[PDB]
Design a protein around this ligand. Structure first.
Ligand SMILES: CON(C)Cc1ccc(O)c2c1C[C@H]1C[C@H]3[C@H](N(C)C)C(O)=C(C(N)=O)C(=O)[C@@]3(O)C(O)=C1C2=O
Ligand SMILES: [Mg+2]
Ligand SMILES: [Mg+2]
Ligand SMILES: [Mg+2]
Ligand SMILES: [Mg+2]
Ligand SMILES: [Mg+2]
Ligand SMILES: [Mg+2]
Ligand SMILES: [Mg+2]
Ligand SMILES: [Mg+2]
Ligand SMILES: [Mg+2]
Ligand SMILES: [Mg+2]
Ligand SMILES: [Mg+2]
Ligand SMILES: [Mg+2]
Ligand SMILES: [Mg+2]
Ligand SMILES: [Mg+2]
Ligand SMILES: [Mg+2]
Ligand SMILES: [Zn+2]
Lengths: 84, 60, 86, 155, 206
RNA sequence: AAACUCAAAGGAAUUGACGGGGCCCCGCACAAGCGGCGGAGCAUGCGGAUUAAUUCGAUGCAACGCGUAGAACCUUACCUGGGUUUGACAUGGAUCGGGAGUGCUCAGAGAUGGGUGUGCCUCUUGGUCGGUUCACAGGUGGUGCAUGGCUGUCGUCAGCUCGUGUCGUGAGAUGUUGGGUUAAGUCCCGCAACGAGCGCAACCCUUGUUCACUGUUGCCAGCACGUUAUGGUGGGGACUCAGUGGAGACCGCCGGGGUCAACUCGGAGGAAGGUGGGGAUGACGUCAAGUCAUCAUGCCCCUUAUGUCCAGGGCUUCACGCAUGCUACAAUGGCUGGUACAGAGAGUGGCGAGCCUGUGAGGGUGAGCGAAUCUCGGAAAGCCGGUCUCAGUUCGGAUUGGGGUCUGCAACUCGACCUCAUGAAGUCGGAGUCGCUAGUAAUCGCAGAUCAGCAACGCUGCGGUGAAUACGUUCCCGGGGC
């Protein structure tokens, strides 16, 4: 994982969008392609549409999400099983 | 290789880590030697033709 | 034994000192090199009374057996990758 | 090979016991290319031999080898539509090789803990006239006697 | 398909490298400029006929030997073409170029010019058998000890590809002390291109 | 007999190929041996399935750790979506120009767009850019059965042909059959053949012996001090080594065999003896073998898209099958302390010592070295002491939970590493199958390419330790002469 002394990586536009949402009301879905970013407490209770390759799947970030990346909650491959 | 890819590789990347080598004669992105640029095929043919000083076949 | 036996096969025996400086190789290779060196020293000291027996014992000879080089397409000098028909 | 009999590498003698037999034994144990490990095993076995009986360990090894040496053994033959087991006499070098190989293999197969005195136990048993090696020698001789009717196929 | 380049095979043994410079921190960039120089010269001086381009460097100064059959094209009128090609060379590289152009004493014996001529005839749609026989006869009139020519491709504008060859004398490809000059060219026809390879056994060298 | 049907049916002979035809041969082809694979876990490639995409190529030997000597972005060729249209990039004419090009900011996932700062050198007509066009570019789009180039392959196999002559109506034959020999169409003998060429061999590289020359960054025998200490020092050409040039092996000598002759056997000398070991080198051709994706190219196709830019995704999927490997299943072993002996290589955005700090990965300082100097550096196996005592274990290290480090704009998909815990299958593997004839197999570590990092256990090299066996050609596979 990322070095501790480098701090968490939030993609610096997701951060600004969630801060603006905090300032103007925590009610909107924030569309982003930043699977790369780190969930932080400052965005807790938001809903973020994380890109998964072809669609911005929405995730409602809760308290326990914080120690995870945004892309962990937007699966990229679909399997459904072999045969049927 | 594609001309657009060659020029994109030539130009400075956005992030330093995103740069790569490309065969400077050939455009090939695989098996490019740092010592003399070029690539696998370019090295072989140019060494045979004798344009690379010091480079000769090895049979030790 | 491989380093002491030059004296044993020569007329002189373990009443004759030797000083050796040894480099490179492993323990057995160093032993063989030291044996050949002692044999050559005895040779060029007494090339008439120790030369015949010393050479007959196959000791005034350096074996050229050296690790054969690895070859492309092969796992080792002669070992080949496991052939798999179909 | 087609060309002819390839030359044989001369067998060296053991520095300690002064017998080519022990050198052949260590070269037969000689797993993984570890000569020192193999001859540590062999020397330990021979010393255990001289411990359990006063006689010389090289002599007891020799007696074991004579007790395991086969005289004749059968080989497959492709005469006709069925395979035959033709008995063939065994030369002294081949039979010494067979005795050593059987000794080492059955020592490895013995149930005791350590290889050194597994081999020591097997050597003593063979010298006495017992053990898996002697049993295999007797079985091969028995099967050669059973198939003795094909001694006329020798070429 | 399975034969080594004669020049690479004899490199260091009998024949020598075309480039003579030493550099251990720029090696790649000097190689790149050399490639640019050679490509430019080949692309813009087909008419002269290039046997070889030999490159030397001393200190930020490049020296180009151009071995050409007819340096009349290279020199133009009173060296005007030579000056213009030199100027294009500074424009391309950025270094001081000293360019000298040399003759080939026996163009009919140098293999590279022989391939040049055979490919030119093939492009001009001359019968390949007649062209190969003419080149072979001219080489042996000059006095080469052995000729071998091979033209591969859609010879005669056909559909299937052929590999027609001529040879007589002796061409010991396997002998390293044998001085064998090797040339290759591509005839650009309305039907793809024909590969013409020429081996010429000049003689034996120490 | 006929209808009908075919454009051949046939004779002898030639050259090939094939034969469960012969004779003679050769190759780890068997046999004789040693170690494996097929079972287990993991790594890796592929088929299949799946998917928005799982880019493309490779398919019996001769596809499958193959193009890949490095897929998180890039690479990237694929998919979703967002941009763009003389285009991301060339070359040339015009035409309006003076900045181009960029620093800081703003909006944006970014592409890009908007700000703001800075703003050509000559010269009265250039370098450089702009548009509008005009030409045009671009394509990893198609066809490897239109091709060039390059490569595999039969095959290091011993062969494949030509000129002239001669024989035959002719294809064609002779040479190139025969006897002997050789690793070899290598030679010898005879011969309607006489010759030559490409292959074989030799010339080349490396290794084994030795001489001369040179002596640092290498070496230290004799001489003088060194902090005790380090060839550290003056110095030395002895030894080693480095690297240039020579010598040396030729069945050359001796004896036997061989009608002789080629060859062959034995011996001496010698470091090396009958090709000393290994590499480079792959004949005429075969397989419409591989590659239009390295490059090049005929034709066809795309041209506000099959061009091109960007972010995210994919190339890493997983009921499965195959293939190549790695680690194992333990005592010839595991753990632990001590202690020996290498070679070949790499290094300035690099190799990094030393010291400090941390359990450690590492971090902080940081000399030295563009390197026979300094660093990578520790070699490991081994030896020696202790310990475990045959236990699914103090074997095995898969998986999984926690805490981390580093590289990078960024380690979710999808990196390596450290540490703590967890402790799976596996008891030597069915039919079948693979490698190897000596410094080889087996094993042991080391280095390099690519490379920020690395899924590398791969690949190419390097040395350490170091075997067993080959009666033999009957059988299996491949090939050679008649
Ligand atoms: C199909 O088109 N028509 C019918 C003929 C055809 C036409 C054009 C082509 O370009 C090829 C082919 C046949 C294929 C067959 C391929 C196959 N292979 C892919 C496994 C194969 O069985 C072998 C082989 N084992 O030797 C080949 O020869 C092969 O590779 C090859 O060359 C081929 C071609 O490319
Ligand atoms: Mg990269
Ligand atoms: Mg007939
Ligand atoms: Mg076998
Ligand atoms: Mg398995
Ligand atoms: Mg694929
Ligand atoms: Mg394609
Ligand atoms: Mg294969
Ligand atoms: Mg083809
Ligand atoms: Mg294909
Ligand atoms: Mg040769
Ligand atoms: Mg094909
Ligand atoms: Mg194309
Ligand atoms: Mg893949
Ligand atoms: Mg360097
Ligand atoms: Mg062999
Ligand atoms: Zn290239």
């Amino acid at each position: 994982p990322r070095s501790l002394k480098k701090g968490p990586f939030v993609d610096e536009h997701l951060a600004k969008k969630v801060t603006a949402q905090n300032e103007a009301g925590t009610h909107n879905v924030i569309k982003t392609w930043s699977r790369r970013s780190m969930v932080t407490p400052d965005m807790i209770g938001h809903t973020i549409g994380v890109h998964d390759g072809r669609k911005h799947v929405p995730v409602f970030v809760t308290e326990s999400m914080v120690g995870h990346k945004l892309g962990e909650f937007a699966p990229t491959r679909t399997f459904k099983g072999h045969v049927k | 290789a594609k001309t657009a890819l060659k020029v994109k590789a030539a130009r400075k990347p956005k992030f330093g880590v995103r740069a790569y080598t490309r065969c400077q004669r050939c455009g090939r992105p695989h098996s490019v030697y740092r010592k003399f640029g070029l690539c696998r095929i370019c090295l072989r043919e140019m060494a045979h033709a004798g344009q690379l000083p010091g480079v000769t076949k090895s049979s030790w | 034994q491989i380093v002491t036996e030059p004296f044993a096969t020569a007329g002189v025996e373990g009443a004759y000192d030797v000083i050796a400086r040894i480099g490179g190789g492993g323990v057995t290779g160093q032993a063989g090199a030291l044996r050949l060196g002692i044999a050559r020293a005895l040779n060029n000291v007494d090339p008439e009374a120790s030369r015949p027996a010393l050479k007959k014992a196959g000791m005034l000879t350096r074996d050229a057996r050296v690790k054969e080089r690895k070859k492309a397409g092969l796992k080792k000098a002669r070992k080949a990758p496991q052939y798999s028909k179909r | 090979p087609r060309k002819g009999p390839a030359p044989k590498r001369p067998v060296m003698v053991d520095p300690v016991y002064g017998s080519p037999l022990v050198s052949q034994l260590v070269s037969k144990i000689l797993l993984d290319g570890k000569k020192t490990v193999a001859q540590n095993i062999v020397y330990t076995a021979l010393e255990g031999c001289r411990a359990k009986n006063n006689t010389d360990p090289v002599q007891t090894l020799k007696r074991a080898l004579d007790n395991i040496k086969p005289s004749l053994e059968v080989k497959s033959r492709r005469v006709g539509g069925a395979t035959y087991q033709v008995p063939v006499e065994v030369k002294p070098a081949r039979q010494t090789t067979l005795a050593m190989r059987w000794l080492v293999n059955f020592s490895r197969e013995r149930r005791e803990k350590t290889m050194a005195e597994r081999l020591m136990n097997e050597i003593l048993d063979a010298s006495n006239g017992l053990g898996a090696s002697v049993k295999r020698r007797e079985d091969t001789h028995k099967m050669a006697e059973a198939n003795r009717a094909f001694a006329h196929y020798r070429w | 398909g399975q034969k080594i380049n004669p020049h690479g095979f004899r490199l260091g043994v009998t024949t020598d490298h075309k480039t003579r410079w030493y550099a251990e921190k720029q090696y790649a960039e000097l190689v790149g400029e050399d490639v640019k120089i050679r490509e430019w010269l080949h692309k813009n001086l087909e008419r002269a006929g290039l046997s070889s381009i030999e490159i030397e460097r001393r200190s930020e100064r490049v020296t180009i030997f151009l071995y050409a059959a007819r340096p009349g094209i290279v020199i133009g009128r009173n060296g005007a073409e030579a000056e213009r090609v030199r100027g294009e060379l500074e424009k391309l590289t950025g270094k001081q170029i000293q360019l000298n152009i040399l003759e080939v004493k026996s163009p009919e014996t140098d293999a590279q010019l022989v391939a040049q001529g055979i490919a030119e005839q093939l492009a001009a749609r001359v019968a390949f058998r007649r062209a190969m026989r003419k080149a072979q006869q001219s080489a042996m009139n000059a006095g080469a000890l052995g000729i071998r020519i091979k033209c591969s491709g859609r010879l005669g504008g056909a559909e299937m590809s052929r590999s027609e060859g001529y040879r007589e004398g002796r061409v010991p490809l396997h002998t390293l002390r044998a001085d064998i000059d090797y040339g290759f060219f591509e005839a650009r026809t309305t039907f793809g291109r024909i590969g013409v390879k020429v081996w010429i056994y000049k003689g034996d060298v120490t």
